[PDB]
Amino acid sequence: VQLVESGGGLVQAGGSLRLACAASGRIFSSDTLAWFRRAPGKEREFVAASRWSGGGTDYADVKGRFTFSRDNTRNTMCLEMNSLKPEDTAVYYCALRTARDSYYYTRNPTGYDYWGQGTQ
Amino acid sequence: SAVWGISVYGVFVLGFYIAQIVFSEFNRMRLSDWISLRPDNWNATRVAVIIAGYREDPFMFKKCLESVRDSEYGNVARLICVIDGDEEEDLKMAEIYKQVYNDNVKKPGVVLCESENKNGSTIDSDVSKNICILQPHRGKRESLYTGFQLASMDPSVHAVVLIDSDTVLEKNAILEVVYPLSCDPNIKAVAGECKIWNTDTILSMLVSWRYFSAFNVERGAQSLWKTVQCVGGPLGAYTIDIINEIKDPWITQTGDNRRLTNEVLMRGKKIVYTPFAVGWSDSPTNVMRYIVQQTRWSKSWCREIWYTLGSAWKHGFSGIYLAFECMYQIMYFFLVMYLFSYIAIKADIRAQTATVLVSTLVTIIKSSYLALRAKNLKAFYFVLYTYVYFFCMIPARITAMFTMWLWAKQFLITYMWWAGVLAAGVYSIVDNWYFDWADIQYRFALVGICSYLVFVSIVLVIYLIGKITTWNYTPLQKELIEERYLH
Amino acid sequence: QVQLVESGGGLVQAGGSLKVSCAASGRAFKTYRMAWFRQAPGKEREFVSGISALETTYYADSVKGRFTISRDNTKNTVSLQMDSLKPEDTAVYYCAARRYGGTDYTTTGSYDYWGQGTQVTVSS
Ligand SMILES: CC(C)CCC[C@@H](C)[C@H]1CC[C@H]2[C@@H]3CC=C4C[C@@H](OC(=O)CCC(=O)O)CC[C@]4(C)[C@H]3CC[C@]12C
Ligand SMILES: CCCCCCCCCCCCO[C@@H]1O[C@H](CO)[C@@H](O[C@H]2O[C@H](CO)[C@@H](O)[C@H](O)[C@H]2O)[C@H](O)[C@H]1O
Ligand SMILES: [Mn+2]
Ligand SMILES: [Mn+2]
């Protein structure tokens, strides 16, 4: 599974962004698709996740402002970030976790074995 | 006398079927009313999926594993895959599992049910990770017991799902087998629908509709009274407490799931059948293999009959239906045998034509109901199931009765039945070798038999046209052939 | 093929009864449609009665309510019981048999095996 994310750039204070993560390779409706943020320095920061079929888990810092949707037909997902703030603009990864080793929800970047390239 | 006997046969066959249809429809309404109250994205029963298999097709095993992985149920604790064998050839299953799942294939040197310590922790340490076991070949019951013990060592697991190594699940099969367990505290098992996908053969095409009838009608009728038989196998949910209670008496008995289901029912626990959970399996394409399979099924049924009757005694006024059905199957077999024997030694053309016409009419009615329920015009192929029954099941029942060279113990009775049917037909032909178009009775007999032959020939020609045009194939079968072409 | 030998006959006074029997010495009698014909002294053969292989009784006009035809297959015989005789019923009664035939069971040519005939007479 190859994940490529598009959308993102310079936003002046409060606004909205739409990031689309497209997956090349079949998803198994049990693979947790997530988004991870990497600010300048720091480490990878979890912002959202949801299973490919149905679910939803938003980070506390983004709960309410960020909307996570999955097409499930074009093998693409969308993250809508509304009411933007200066502190979350660096990088988003839209990783994937397969329910092969275990079905347990992780929320940790170590459990996601497929990742995309950094998008502003 | 002949008219009375034919009328009795007609009522006896078409009244129980109508009652079963009504009971299955009421069970469907009850289950639909249960589902209509189910909250969106419902996952309250933790589930461990158990796959027990022995040397299955590498393609179909991979399809089954991928169907399990591509399931929309949100609460699945683990996958337990037990393989009856640690030989070199049995490692292909482990390789397929590693292709679809993690590299957690374990090869204990012992069978878990034949040890002093039968706990799953003796052969396992982590309950979070999906597990594959390569255990020595003993039988389906031993691998199923190992899976039960592996599922029972997690205290958070509430129910368990049993599917075959070749069952291609729908994306909502697990949800619909585990939901009815929460709709009644006394429901400890749920049976899911099994559908035949490989309808590319005349035998398999009819066996698909036989499976459709025997599941839908004959299990909704049981589920109205909540005494469904043979739960598990291709698709079935069992509560973890009931298996914890009944696994030891079931494994220490001196795999058909019939005894497991009867162990559930003997304790006063209800079992339902949900038509909204579908798993796809295949059927034998050979008549002879079908004959031996039906002989084994009849032997199992005849072995577990006293226990079934005792189980349908623990339910006060329920279970009367189960006892009535158990007696009805025997009475129907002997009624068919007696009718054929009577009309075969009399060589009366009117009686034989009337019998074949009445059987064709009742099977046409049954096929019409099947087509209405399935929304499939291919369900009218079920009119040809009369031949399959008369030529494969009756020999199977007689062989099961008589066996409870290796060829003789399997096929001698079948060949003798075929020879007897041929001899009866030839005797009836040579005993009525005359033509009389001036007699209205002879005209009726000849026209009826000719119309029946024309009808069956037209049905066969329709089947042949569908076979050439691949219109008899299920969509899953077309997908599977397309995938197999390139692997 | 069946060889038909006939019995019965004699003289009746009026309004009486009689029975004419015809025994067939063939092989498969139960497949043979049988018939009884009468031939008046100054007329031709007339179909009087008949019974099919599957028992189905046919009677002619002025015969429906008076005659009765039956067949025994254990003893290969066909019997006609004439329960009310009239002077017009003074005729020679033959028995005919067939195995394969068409829609016409009445013509003399429909039956290929024939009996010899028993003279049945009634005198006023
Ligand atoms: C030697 C040749 C010229 C003919 C020899 C074969 C026949 C004597 C066989 C072939 C098909 C047979 C029939 C096929 C199916 C049935 C259905 C069977 O009834 C059922 O089992 C149907 C059950 C239902 O109604 O659901 C009763 C016997 C009968 C009429 C069989 C009677 C004997 C038949 C006519
Ligand atoms: C004296 C009377 C003479 C005989 C008349 C009565 C005989 C009636 C026999 C009924 C047999 C039908 O019952 C049949 O049993 C077999 C096993 O037992 C079940 O078979 C079950 O186990 C097998 C193997 O585990 C699975 O492949 C199959 O998917 C599963 O459903 C059938 O689903 C059930 O329908
Ligand atoms: Mn197989
Ligand atoms: Mn199979």
Residue B3, domain member (yes or no): no
- Which residues have CB under 8 Å from B228's CB, separation 6+? B189, B191, B219, B222, B261, B271, B272, B273
CB-based contacts of B18, cutoff 8 Å, min separation 6: none
Nearest residue to A48 via CA among A113, A102, A93, A14: A93
* Vertex B135 angle, CA B133 and B136, to 5°: 165
Q: Which of B295, B275, B267 is nearest to B173 (CA)?
A: B275
Same domain, B277 and B171: yes
Tell which phi-psi region holds residue A17, choosing left (phi > 0), alpha (psi between -120 and 50) or beta: beta
**A73, A100, A105, A106: which to substitute to probe chain B, counting the most B Cβ within 10 Å?**
A100
Which residue in C53, C104, C110 is closest to B434 by CB distance?
A: C53
Report how this structure was experimentally obtained: cryo-EM
Q: Give the residue carrying structure tokens 């509709």.
A: B209
How far, CA to CA in Å, does B141 sit from each of B20, B145, B280, B410?
A: 31, 6, 22, 24
Q: Judge whether A24 and A4 are in contact, CB under 8 Å.
A: yes
Same domain, B438 and B325: yes
Taking the centre of ligand 4 as the mean of its atom positions, its distance from the CA of residue B283, in whole angstroms, is: 6
Q: Would you say the C-alpha torsion B2, B4, B10, B12 has a positive or negative sign?
A: negative
CB distance C101 to C83 below 8 Å = no
B70 and A100 in contact by Cβ < 8 A? no
CB contact under 8 A, C99 and B440: no
For chain A, how big is the Rg over CA atoms in Å? Answer: 13
Residue numbers in C near B434 (CB within 8 A): 31-33, 53, 99-100
Nearest CA to CA, how far is A13 from chain B (Å)? Answer: 36
Question: How many domains would you assign to chain B?
Answer: 2
Q: Would you say the CB of residue B13 lies under 6 angstroms from ligand 1?
A: yes
CA dist B156 and B45 (Å) reads 9
Bridge-based pairing of strands B47-53 and B76-84 is: parallel
Residues 6+ apart with CB under 8 A from B429: none
Token pair recorded at residue B475: 């969509």
Residues B383 and B463: their CA atoms lie apart, in Å, by 12
Q: Which helix (H) or strand (E) holds A68?
A: strand A66-70
Residue with tokens 């340490």: B125
Residue where a domain stops, chosen among B262, B284, B306? B284
Residues from A contacting B (CB-CB < 8 Å) are: 28-30, 51, 53-55, 99-104
CB B474 within 8 A of CB B199: yes
Chain B contact for C103 (CB, 8 A cutoff): yes
Residue B97: domain span: 17-284
Bind-site residues of B for Mn(2+):
56, 164, 166, 282
Minimum Cα–Cα distance from C28: chain B residue: B431
Q: Chains A/C: 3 or more C-beta pairs closer than 8 A?
A: no
If asked whether residues B401 and B468 sit together in one domain, one would say yes
Closest CA to B373 of B27, B93, B7, B55: B27
Which residue's entry shows tokens 């098992």?
B189
Is the same domain home to B351 and B449? yes
B257-276 exposure pattern, b = at least 16 Cβ within 10 A, e = fewer: bbbbbbbbbbeebbbbbbbb
Residue B436, chain C, CB below 8 Å: the answer is yes
- Report the relative pairing of strands C57-59 and C45-51 from DSSP bridges: antiparallel
Q: Of the candidates B458, B339, B455, which has an alpha carbon nearest to the alpha carbon of residue B2? A: B339
Kindly state whether residue B42 falls inside one of the protein's structural domains: yes
CB contact under 8 A, B438 and C104: yes
Residue A36 lies inside a defined structural domain of this protein:
yes
Angle of helix B349-374 relative to helix B320-346, nearest 10 degrees, comes to 140
Name which of C56, C99, C103 is nearest B434 (Cβ-Cβ): C99
Q: What are phi and psi of C120, to 5 degrees?
A: -105, 120
Residue of A100, A105, C117, A22 lying closest to B68 (CA atoms): A100
State whether the beta carbon of B273 lies less than 6 angstroms from ligand 2.
no
**Short-list B413, B432, B442, CA closest to B294:** B413
Clarify whether residues B96 and B211 are in a common domain: yes
Phi, psi of B239 (to 5 degrees): -70, 145
Atom of ligand 1 nearest to the CA of B429: 3
Three-state secondary structure readout of chain B? CHHHHHHHHHHHHHHHHHHHHHHHHHHHHHHHHHHHCCCCCCCCCCEEEEEEECCCCHHHHHHHHHHHHCCCCCCEEEEEEEEECCCCCCHHHHHHHHHHCCCCEECCCCCHHHCCCCCHHHCCCCCCECEEEEECCCCHHHHHHHHHHHHHCCCCCCEEEEEECCCEECCCHHHHHHCHHHCCCCEEEEEEEEEECCCCCHHHHHHHHHHHHHHHHHHHHHHHHCECCCCECCEEEEEHHHHHHHHHHHHCCCCCCHHHHHHHHCCCCEEEEEEEEEEEECCCCCHHHHHHHHHHHHHHHHHCCHHHHHHCCCCCCCCHHHHHHHHHHHHHHHHHHHHHHHHHHHCCHHHHHHHHHHHHHHHHHHHHHHHHHHCCHHHHHHHHHHHHHHHHHHHHHHHHHHCCCCCHHHHHHHHHHHHHHHHHHHHHHHHCCCEECCCHHHHHHHHHHHHHHHHHHHHHHHHHHHHHCCCCCCHHHHHHHHHHHHC
CA C15 – CA C79 distance, rounded (Å): 19
Name the token pair of B412.
Answer: 């001698």
- Split into its structural domains, chain A has a count of 1
Mutational pocket test of ligand 1: of B9, B334, B341, B421, the residue with most ligand atoms within 8 Å of the beta carbon: B421
Separation of CA B358 and ligand 1 centre (Å): 11
CATH number, domain containing residue A86: 2.60.40.10
In the sheet with A57-58, reading across from the earlier edge strand, the strands are A57-58, A44-51, A32-38, A96-97
| Shortest-distance Cα residue to atom 17 of ligand 1 | B386
Of B234, B281, B250, give the one whose Cα is nearest residue B51: B234
First-to-last alpha carbon distance for chain C, in angstroms, is: 39
The structure tokens listed for B321 are 């239906």
Q: Which residue has the least CA distance to atom 2 on ligand 2? A: B330
HEC-encoded secondary structure of C58-92: EECCCCCCCEEEEEECCCCEEEEEECCCCHHHCEE
B459: CA distance to ligand 2 center in Å? 28
Alpha carbon distance A56, A107 (integer Å): 12
Grouping H, G, I as helix, E, B as strand and the rest as coil, residue A88 is: coil
Provide the residue range defining the domain that includes C15: 3-122
- Residue B62: C-alpha distances to residues A19, B379, B406, C87 (Å): 35, 30, 35, 96
Confirm or reject contact between C109 and chain B (CB < 8 A).
Answer: no
Token pair 């194939």 in the structure block, residue? B473
User: Atom of ligand 2 at shortest distance to CA of B294?
Assistant: 11
Give strand pairing partners of B72. Answer: none
| Helix then strand then coil, % of chain A, to nearest 5 | 0, 40, 55
Question: Is there an atom of ligand 2 within 6 Å of B386 CB?
Answer: no
Could you tell me the distance, in angstroms and rounded to a whole number, from the CA of residue B128 to the centre of ligand 3? 29
Q: Please give the distance, rounded to the nearest whole angstrom, from the Cα atom of residue B198 to the centre of ligand 4.
A: 10
For the Cβ of B340 lying below 6 angstroms from any atom of ligand 1, the answer is: yes
Provide the CB-side half-sphere exposure for B480 (13 A, CA). 26
For residues A83 and A14, the answer to whether their CB atoms sit within 8 Å is yes
The partner residues of C70 in beta bridges, in order of sequence, read C79
Does some domain include residue A117?
no
Distance B99 CA to ligand 4 centre (A): 21
A99 exposure class (CB count in 10 Å sphere: 0-12, 13-18, 19+): buried
Rounded distance, CA B348 to CA C53, Å? Answer: 11
Token pair of C88, please? 């017009």
The answer as to whether A15 is a domain residue is yes
Last residue within a domain, chosen from B261, B284, B307: B284
Burial of A90 (0-12, 13-18, 19+ CB in 10 A): middle
Neighbours of B418 (CB within 10 A): 13
- Give the one of A54, A101, A103 whose C-beta lies nearest to B41's C-beta: A54
Residue B198 falls inside a structural domain = yes
Q: Do A30 and B41 touch (CB under 8 A)?
A: no
**B144-154: b or e for each residue (b if 16 or more CB lie within 10 Å)?**
bbbbbbbbbbb
A19 DSSP assignment: E
Lookup: tokens for A16: 């909205």
**DSSP 8-class letter at C94:** E
**For residue B322, what are the CA distances in angstroms to B28, B30, B255?**
19, 19, 22
Q: Which 3 state secondary structure label does DSSP give A41? A: coil
Sheet-wide strand order for B159-164: B105-106, B131-135, B76-84, B47-53, B159-164, B235-239, B187-196, B270-281, B168-169
Q: Which residue has the tokens 């979350």?
A: A88
Residue having the nearest C-alpha atom to atom 22 of ligand 1: B386
**Separation between Cα atoms, residue B289 and residue C36, nearest integer Å:** 59
With beta carbons less than 8 A apart as the criterion, state whether C21 and C49 touch.
no
Asked whether the beta carbons of residue A53 and residue B101 sit closer than 8 angstroms, the reply is no
Q: Give the residue from B427, B395, B424, B388 showing the smallest Cα distance to B411.
A: B395
Cβ distance C101 to B435 less than 8 Å, yes or no, reads yes
Distance CA B195, CA B127 (A): 32
Q: Which residue of A has its CA nearest to B71?
A: A29
CA distance B298 to C57: 49
B54: domain CATH number is 3.90.550.10
Sign of CA dihedral A81, A84, A88, A89: positive
Interface test with B, best of A26, A31, A103, A108 (most B CBs within 10 A): A103
